[PDB]
Design a protein around this ligand. Sequence first.
Ligand SMILES: O=S1(=O)N(Cc2ccccc2)[C@H](COc2ccccc2)[C@H](O)[C@@H](O)[C@@H](COc2ccccc2)N1Cc1ccccc1
Lengths: 99, 99
Amino acid sequence: PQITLWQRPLVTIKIGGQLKEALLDTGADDTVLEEMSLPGRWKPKMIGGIGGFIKVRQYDQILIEICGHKAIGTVLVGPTPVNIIGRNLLTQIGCTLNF
Amino acid sequence: PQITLWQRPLVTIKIGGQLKEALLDTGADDTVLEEMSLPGRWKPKMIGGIGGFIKVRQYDQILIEICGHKAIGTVLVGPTPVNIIGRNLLTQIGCTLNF
Ligand SMILES: O=S1(=O)N(Cc2ccccc2)[C@H](COc2ccccc2)[C@H](O)[C@@H](O)[C@@H](COc2ccccc2)N1Cc1ccccc1
């Protein structure tokens, strides 16, 4: 679809069987979701932006469905205030910025 | 143009007669630039990222050119990790997310 930026670009995603709302964030290199249980081994990682860094757990090869589009990629899980879909997954769904 | 997300969506912007690199960021409600001098009075504003909130200075009616597109809007200045062009200016240049 064509998403305007008058409002926050929130989309419904499906991961681990759970439906969540997430922000399409072109400035985010990675995808970070609020605390949740994901299967598999994970690696600790530190990601930061405005306000500083947070410790997250990195899960690789996670299948996510973004607005009906399946994508596979690394997902970070941690105390983020908002679920963020970063570039690692937006590329997979063929998302582009147009103007 | 159509910008893919395989690499960070960095564009050249011109503000205060200088060229700087900024990130086209759909996850940011506002535009925040690294420390710099802008004209006029500023108001205080708190903006939050994944790690918390930071205090920034808000300047209104600032002319900024984003990829040859002139926009005039609110610009925030503060300890941001990178120059971020947010939704307030992205809507001004008619930027949309597509997939
Ligand atoms: O957390 S963020 O700060 N984020 C960081 C991030 C890094 C790695 C993975 C995921 C996220 C970047 C910015 O950080 C960097 C740092 C270095 C390179 C690139 C991006 C993001 O794209 C922005 O969009 C801002 C929102 O900035 C704002 C500016 C003005 C007003 C409001 C917000 N945040 C995301 C965010 C959005 C909404 C709520 C909470 C958090």
